[PDB]
C-alpha cells in the first residue's frame, strides 16, 4: 500500500529501466556482495571473481528473469501474494533460499537504481521503491510463514 504520488514515481522511473541490464546487475551484485547466494547457482560455472559473475551469460539471462517478476508485481500492487505465489513455493519447498536473501536482493536492486539513475533516484523515490521491495520480498516469503 502506497500514495498515488509514490505509484506515479515507481511506474515513471520503471519505464526508463531497459532491457534488462539492471536485472543482471542486481543478480550479479547479490552474488558478489553476498557470496553465499552463489551456492544456489553452482551450475552457472565460474563465479570466482566479481568480473566472472558480471561477465557470466547464465547470470545475465537469469537477471532478465528476476527483474521480469518485479515488473509483473509492479502492475499487481494491491495483490502481491497471488502474483508471486507461483514463485514463492519454488524458492521455499525445495530450492531452500533463506528469506533474508530476499531482502538483500531487494536492497541491491535499490543500489542498482541509484547507480543507473543517479540524482534522479531522489530520496522520496527511494522511499517509494523501499515499500515495493519490502512488499516483493514479503510476497516471495509467504510460503515459509
Partner 1 sequence: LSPADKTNVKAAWGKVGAHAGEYGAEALERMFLSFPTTKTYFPHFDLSHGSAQVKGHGKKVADALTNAVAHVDDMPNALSALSDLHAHKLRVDPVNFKLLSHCLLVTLAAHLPAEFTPAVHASLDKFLASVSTVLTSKYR
Residue ranges at the known binding site for (2R)-2,3-bisphosphoglycerate: 1, 81, 142
Q: Is 40 in the site for ligand HEM (CB under 6 A)?
A: yes
Q: Is 17 in the site for partner 1 (CB under 8 A)?
A: no
Scanning residues 87 to 106, which ones bind ligand HNI (CB under 6 A)?
87, 91, 95, 97, 101-102, 105
Contacted entry of ligand HEM, ligand HNI, partner 1, none for residue 10, CB cut-off 5 to 8 Å set by kind = none
- Min separation Cβ 2 and ligand HNI, Å: 18
**Spatial distance between the Cα atoms of 58 and 41, rounded to a whole number of angstroms:** 9
Residues recorded for the chain: 145
**Spatial distance between the Cα atoms of 64 and 78, rounded to a whole number of angstroms:** 24
Residue 36 per-residue DSSP state? G
Residue with cell 526508463: 16
Q: Is 21 in the site for partner 1 (CB under 8 A)?
A: no
How many Å is the Cα radius of gyration of the chain?
15
Among 35, 46, 58, 65, binds ligand HEM (CB under 6 A): 65
**Spatial distance between the Cα atoms of 26 and 3, rounded to a whole number of angstroms:** 26
**Spatial distance between the Cα atoms of 40 and 37, rounded to a whole number of angstroms:** 6
Question: Which residues contact ligand HEM (rule: CB under 6 A)?
Answer: 37, 40-41, 65-66, 69-70, 87, 91, 95, 97, 101-102, 105-106, 136-137, 140
Amino acid at each position: 500500500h502506497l500514495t498515488p504520488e509514490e505509484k506515479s514515481a515507481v511506474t515513471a522511473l520503471w519505464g526508463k529501466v531497459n532491457v534488462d541490464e539492471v536485472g543482471g546487475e542486481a543478480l550479479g551484485r547479490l552474488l558478489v556482495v553476498y557470496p553465499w547466494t552463489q551456492r544456489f547457482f553452482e551450475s552457472f560455472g565460474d563465479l570466482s571473481t566479481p568480473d566472472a559473475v558480471m561477465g557470466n551469460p547464465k547470470v545475465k539471462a537469469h537477471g532478465k528473469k528476476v527483474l521480469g517478476a518485479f515488473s509483473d508485481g509492479l502492475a499487481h500492487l494491491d495483490n502481491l501474494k497471488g502474483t508471486f505465489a507461483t514463485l514463492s513455493e519454488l524458492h521455499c519447498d525445495k530450492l531452500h533460499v533463506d528469506p533474508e536473501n530476499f531482502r538483500l536482493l531487494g536492497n541491491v536492486l535499490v543500489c542498482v537504481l541509484a547507480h543507473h539513475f543517479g540524482k534522479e533516484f531522489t530520496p522520496p523515490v527511494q522511499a517509494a521503491y523501499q515499500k515495493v521491495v519490502a512488499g516483493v520480498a514479503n510476497a516471495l516469503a509467504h510460503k515459509y510463514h
